[PDB]
Design a protein around this nucleic acid. Sequence first.
RNA 1: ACGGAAACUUAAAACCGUGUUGCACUGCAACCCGGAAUUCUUGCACGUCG
Length: 54
Amino acid sequence: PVRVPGHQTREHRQYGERFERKELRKSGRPNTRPQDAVNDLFQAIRVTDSPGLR
RNA sequence: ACGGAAACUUAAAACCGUGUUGCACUGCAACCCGGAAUUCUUGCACGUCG
């Protein structure tokens, strides 16, 4: 299980960033990089916002 | 001392005067600046309480 290694605030929480583009962006077009906005596979489901209540 | 010997066919005079290369005539009739392209794909108002 991967950790959040670092002493300063710049490198405490940063492993939520560099791991979020490792096994999560695998759509794999032959002309675009994986590690950006296009090649995501987490764009599968499409959330609809909840209605208004009392 | 040859019907011989002398003599300019000569002087002047404007081929000039009147007269539009002119009058009628569309550079005109017909046409689309017209057809096919997602403003898009990654993203939690939250860490923080002796």
